[PDB]
Amino acid sequence: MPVFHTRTIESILEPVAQQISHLVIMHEEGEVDGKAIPDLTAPVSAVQAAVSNLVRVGKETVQTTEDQILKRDMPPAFIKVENACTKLVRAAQMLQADPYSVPARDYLIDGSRGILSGTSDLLLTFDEAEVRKIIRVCKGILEYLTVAEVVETMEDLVTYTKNLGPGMTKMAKMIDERQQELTHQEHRVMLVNSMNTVKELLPVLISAMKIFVTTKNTKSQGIEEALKNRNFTVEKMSAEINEIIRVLQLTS
């Protein structure tokens, strides 16, 4: 009912959510009363297997995961989809004995709805997890920006620049690829701008620490001035990164 979120979520659930909305409108919402639904035994068994298989895989995902909200959050969705399958199975039994059965049609709507919504749940929970893996990269880079303040030698700065390399390269490849999977344009804009600001400020940071190391080893100059520019680059990078983390959590 609200937009699916990512291109994967939307392309999985969109055919289903479409077909359901129709089927409602039709039978339910008045309209095709005294109607007659054909025999669903075969399609409902196919669904029932696909829910075995989904709960199979998902229970592996659950026991074989590092993520702690993944562990706790997924299971309920297994309970939601199994329940909904149960309704679909009574639906098709009832319909076999009375094509015109109005309880059966209702079970089939709720059945279908609960399959859509439990799998929505399972996919949001999986996606939250994936977002957290980008947030970890973002948070560790923020942690490392905290430490720029302590570089004082050219050798520390060589070391600092070499650890912070991988980190920004990875953050950037993550946000870029994530941005592509997004379905809200106000959200892709935001991520990309932020990552652009970040990427362009990186050499500004390195230059500003070089300036700093260099007046802190030429025993004087204007060192206040050099340090506050460094502190401003670091705060601007931090703030952008904090926005990246925020906007990644947006779903609408």
Binding site: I12, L13, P15, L40, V47, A50, L54, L122, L123
Partner: peptide, 24 residues
């Protein structure tokens, strides 16, 4: 990664083929 997202898809396919069958 992948195995979960295909299982979900296969389920969504199937639910949709089932609600096709029902007419709508």
């Amino acid at each position: 990664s992948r195995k979960l997202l295909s299982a979900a898809k296969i389920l969504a396919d199937a639910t949709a083929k089932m609600v096709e069958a029902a007419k709508g």
